Design a binder for this molecule. Structure first.
Ligand SMILES: CC(=O)Nc1cc(N)ccc1C
Ligand SMILES: CC(=O)Nc1cc(N)ccc1C
Ligand SMILES: [Cl-]
Length: 147
């Protein structure tokens, strides 16, 4: 009885219930409450050797494995969630997308325009919410819905 895409889950380590969104891969302790023509998102992309274009402004030849990319994504999420780092700072420094130079901002878009998993996560996020790891042919994304 939860917003689109949410399910109850059980923490293995602590035994406490949490909520998981299978569209955004977000997870959180707190019970979520609750479609625009357009949303605005920022993202942090980590590419891997199987990315559509395994090359970025950071690295002419991206050689990391998808597993390694996911560990990096997980570490960025941890630091954003802890407040040790800001999303925008990590995107500027470490996103393999050319949008890193705009602190990850992709601007506004509607359905049909972005890769489908990215699109679906974006529209399932509430304004201000952040995804978990989202997989596309580009690689692995942390998505921040800003509008
Ligand atoms: C992939 C993409 O959209 N990149 C980008 C986004 C913004 N906002 C500014 C400049 C660039 C190059
Ligand atoms: C963020 C995103 O999904 N970008 C994108 C969208 C399409 N349609 C094709 C290729 C890329 C890289
Ligand atoms: Cl590009």
């Amino acid at each position: 009885k939860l917003p689109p895409g949410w399910e109850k889950a059980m923490s293995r380590s602590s035994g406490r219930v949490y909520y998981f969104n299978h569209i955004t891969n977000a997870s959180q302790w707190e019970r979520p409450s609750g479609e625009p023509a357009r949303v605005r998102c920022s993202h942090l992309l980590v590419k891997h050797s199987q990315s559509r274009r395994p090359s970025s402004w950071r690295q002419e030849k991206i050689t990391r494995t998808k597993e390694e990319a996911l560990e990096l994504i997980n570490g960025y999420i941890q630091k954003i969630k802890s407040g040790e780092e800001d999303f925008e700072s990590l995107a500027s420094q470490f996103s393999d997308c050319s949008s890193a130079k705009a602190r990850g901002d992709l601007g506004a878009f509607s359905r049909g325009q972005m890769q489908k998993p990215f699109e679906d996560a974006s529209f399932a996020l509430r304004t201000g919410e952040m995804s978990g790891p989202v997989f596309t042919d580009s690689g692995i994304h942390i998505i921040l819905r800003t509008e």
